[PDB]
Symmetry: C3
Subunit: 490 residues, 3 copies
């Protein structure tokens, strides 16, 4: 009669690395690295992205004729654009503090156009001024959200105002025209030596037109320079100009949800839903890390420069035909026949044989490994982030500093993730090793000299041991007083 201590083996060819060993085959393993995306551009927490396609934010807000059929949701979580949007300032020029503007309208509630300065009420000015650079049909056209040239032969001082009674912060854009030459100034605005002034309770600005010689861009040597401000509720904005004013017709009511970013991609909305979007597609995961794309938006796993992070959950797989020396050691191989536990017994007596999982050590192992995997996964913080940022080409240093920070964390997470995995795997294999070793000793210390140690994790009894006796061994209530029979040993 005999009982033998042993451990589970199977047909897994799954491999993991440890600190001490490479490519160890384990019975089971879990990948903590998310590599797959659904390939879709989705909504984020129910709220869709604003889809700009070929238009830039400036193009959209000024109303570049080529952005007319923009869908323009009432509410958005992020903004989707193509890499180098072709439709922006159709009439050539610049846009002050453009990047701050973008960052501001990145996530909105609540977004409503308002006709703050009706085209029709500039009664003493011509209002149909257009350009072939903004051509439609084609005829000379212009930014649709914007409007002034002399009426006949007179450019009276233009004085209009607007009180923000919309019940919300209003974004307002305006421009100044920089003519090509003096004759052009006088033919457009009659007056020379002009200005454009804009005032609110916090904004103070007066611009003078700059008449100079420049190359043609979209066929035009002239330039238009735009600025913007946030008009507070119940506050007034006053425009005054003797010429060169590019007036807005509309302002924009803004309620900031939070702060998001702009995603560059050629994909379009679908729904689908996600908590984490990438330019490649969305990510749905529990895992602490991913390697899909650095530029994400939402609550995402830590991005790492890794192609594989696999945790061992089972033990070393040793099918047959360690710090503790049990597994692949003094018990030379695992049992494929023992399918209902991690560690257990094989027995032979008169009544037969012989596999039985040990429920106690098995359940300790299940509870332990589950805890370990859960620790590694659950302790990871996950706050909302919009990685990609916008910088002008005179902000290269600021851009480089942002890049240096993202690279820094990447290096920290990657190295930390890789080593954590190598170190825990080593521990996990030793944990199994030790459980086996302790099971063997549990049996050895019960039986004492009522049995012989045969090697290979086996015990031969110096007495008959029936199924009831075997149970007592397996559940730790073996009765040693019975040391006779046993002198059968001598």
């Amino acid at each position: 009669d005999q009982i033998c201590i042993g451990y589970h083996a199977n047909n897994s060819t799954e491999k993991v690395d440890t600190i001490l060993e490479r490519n160890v085959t384990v019975t089971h393993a879990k990948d903590i690295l998310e590599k797959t995306h659904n390939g879709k551009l989705c909504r984020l927490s129910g709220i869709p992205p604003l889809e700009l396609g070929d238009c830039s934010i400036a193009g959209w807000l000024l109303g570049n004729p080529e952005c007319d059929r923009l869908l323009s949701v009432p509410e958005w979580s992020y903004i989707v654009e193509k890499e180098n949007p072709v439709n922006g300032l159709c009439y050539p020029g610049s846009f002050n503090d453009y990047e701050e503007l973008k960052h501001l309208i990145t996530s909105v509630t609540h977004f409503e156009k308002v006709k703050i300065l009706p085209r029709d009420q500039w009664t003493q000015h011509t209002t149909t001024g257009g350009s072939r650079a903004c051509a439609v049909l084609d005829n000379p056209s212009f930014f649709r959200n914007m409007v002034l040239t002399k009426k006949g032969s007179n450019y009276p001082i233009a004085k209009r105002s607007y009180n923000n009674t919309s019940g919300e912060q209003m974004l307002i854009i305006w421009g100044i025209h920089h003519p090509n030459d003096d004759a052009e100034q006088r033919t457009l605005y009659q007056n020379v030596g002009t200005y454009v002034s804009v005032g609110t309770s916090t904004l103070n600005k007066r611009s003078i037109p700059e008449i100079a010689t420049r190359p043609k861009v979209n066929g035009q040597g002239g330039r238009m320079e735009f600025s913007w401000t946030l008009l507070e509720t119940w506050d007034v904005i006053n425009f005054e100009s003797t010429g060169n004013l590019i007036a807005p017709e509309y302002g924009f009511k803004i309620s900031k949800r939070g702060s998001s970013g702009i995603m560059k991609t050629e994909k379009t909305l679908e729904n689908c839903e996600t908590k984490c979007q990438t330019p490649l597609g969305a990510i749905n995961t529990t895992l602490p890390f991913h390697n899909i794309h650095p530029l994400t938006i939402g609550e995402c796993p830590k991005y790492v420069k890794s192609d594989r992070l696999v945790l061992a959950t089972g033990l070393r797989n040793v099918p047959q035909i360690g710090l503790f020396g049990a597994i692949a050691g003094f018990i030379e191989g695992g049992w494929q026949g023992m399918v209902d536990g991690w560690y257990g017994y094989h027995h032979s007596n008169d009544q037969g044989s012989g596999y039985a999982a040990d429920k106690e050590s098995t359940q300790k192992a299940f509870d332990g490994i589950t805890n370990k995997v859960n620790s590694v996964i659950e302790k990871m913080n996950t706050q909302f982030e919009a990685v990609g940022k916008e910088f002008s080409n005179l902000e290269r240093r600021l851009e480089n500093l942002n890049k240096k920070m993202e690279d820094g964390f990447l290096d920290v997470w990657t190295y930390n993730a890789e080593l954590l995995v190598l170190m825990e795997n080593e521990r996990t294999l030793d944990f199994h090793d030790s459980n086996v070793k302790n099971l063997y000793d549990k049996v050895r210390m019960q039986l004492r000299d009522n049995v012989k140690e045969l090697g290979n994790g086996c015990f031969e009894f110096y007495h008959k041991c029936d199924d009831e006796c075997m149970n007592s061994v397996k559940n730790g209530t073996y009765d040693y007083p019975k040391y006779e029979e046993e002198s059968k040993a001598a």
Copy 2:
């Protein structure tokens, strides 16, 4: 007989390990600090500048509402209310205001001095003021600042100052932006005017920007202030054809390092600290804290955690090696002098005796673990809160992203350090018990039965002297080898 055993007590302290939750241990050490003293304190002997509900601009310009301030000549940080009420009484703006605020967060020395006495502007009217700065309640004006046409003429306003004071000097000046050309003529006579300021490093010019504007503090006009740091022995030249708001004073300033502004309602209560937060100060040696992110001083790492409890004692049982809660089922309330030890049973009596050797070794070990964790942590001076204008949102976001990045790294790594090391500490105790058990077993060999519960049953009479040789590892096997099992 002689038995091997380990310590137990009435502790109910819980720790988590990588493999286990809520494990009761005999002793634990919390390494997360979560108490402050509730007070606003001095930082390394040097007090903060308390501005109450005045802003830094309001204080330096001399907003009348800031007269009874009480500044010190030296401070290690600045305390402000979340939203100061007293800044620019006369509406306007302050160029590079944030750069200025950053410069004076921490000073030594700091002294206001008169550099351009106002009575020496003999060709200009200097008494001008505003109901925006109303006192009592007549027109008044920023008390450190001063120019309007005299009769009907505004001659060039040209004066200079040489910084012979011995320290770098802060000097602030402004330009006034009137309501319309008519008011410009009324105040300054001329229309196309300018304000030029020059030192040997700074060249700045401002022109009036007239626009129609809503009344703020009753006024449509605005003032735009600028500033420079005048080096020792350098000159500053003011030259203006109109619109200059001139300084009468300057500020001598010696800077040691940089600090920050703290937003709080509290007032200095007279205590010392090395680490201040808006809720109170922190006096601690622990490597982590969760009191508040915006600290000033030499502070523990701020983590998102509620609890970081390191196990020091062993599992409390009133492991990898199979002894604790293993073949030795439980602890011994009775053994008080050590973690590990023996219970003996003789004709002479019983029974407890601590093993001071393996206990001391263990204690030294755990002592090294604790202060390896605690002492490897760096703690250089830092001021977390920073200032950004509302056109630096991207920059402010970059800063938050950075603080959030380190918060995440530290929080994760601290939680995981505690779990990992707690499992090793419990295993370390387990190993010490096992090793002690084996020391005895390998000493007794044949002369004793291994019972399997921690106990050894002698095949001979072992009196007290003999027991002592077992404990001190000199048991004489050959002497008692008479066996007769």
Copy 3:
């Protein structure tokens, strides 16, 4: 006749720290902190740095007389300056967006000065003007790459010239405006009052008016020159127009970029060596993960930490004469006499002797430790970075943000490198202890009761055991039943 289990000891004096223990002597050790450098300034990935010495980038590009013959390379990978360069704006002034300019030319391929606006084609203006502030020896001179346009006789007619970039590459172009000390100087130089300077390209549009005002003399001058720059695209035109106060370029700079680098501040000069990582003290050439040489590096560098020592144990605890209780435990000391392995056997016989190492155990241990060491090294991700940055006097907050980030990483890497070392040294010592305990048990299970277990690592045989039998024990094929007849007495 006896056989003993033991471990290697030597003359090593090397010390390591572990999480539980300070100053433990080990037989072998390996430092993973790079502390040495070659003490030279080197080519970075084949490409030399630009050496400016005591000249500033501005001094060099404008052609300050003390800077002009600088003798540059056509391609560079970084820039080297003295801490505080003596030569810059000899005529006092300022440079707009200077830090961004310096960041732009930090790393190039290709670079080439070209004469874009021949000094002599300014026919209607005087062109030879200079300053005592730029005195050569000791005649008034001027920035050699620029042209100080002044009146011809009593006339300054409108100055107008343009240049089309047909060079093949983007072109850096610089210009300036003179802000005189007083009206008399304005009239002497330019005749006209109320002048302006105008410059325009496809994207750039600027008009500046001179600022006449009294200022402290610097290098004898009260006036100032404010310089600006732009990048002119291929096939674009730049237009200059001035009625006075223009400081025109004569030259432009063809520039191609292939990434960004940095400026390095050192007294050192270029030697003939190659590196992937440069320091102001010398070049680093290591695979190690950490270094403590200097914070301001350029290249693909190890992570900088505050420590002076990171020593990993590789050999075992040196006990000249643990979790597992053998090393410095029940086997009290090591053997200076076992030189052919980490663990092994002694054996005392009728035939004498002796020592012999267990090759298999030793070999498995060497493999483990090697993987360990390589894991810590190989998992570290390295990226190209230039640590030192340029910020102006009004960018203190930005500078402080950069410092806070570097300090943040420094604390993270230093704390984790040191804790890693301590943790792994604990596990390494215990690894060895375990290998020893496992070897001893392997012997114990073969010999069984044919021998006495002393308790100090030795086994006393109950039977004569010659060299062949001593080998079977070492071998794992002892044959217990062969000597079973003959033990104790029977």
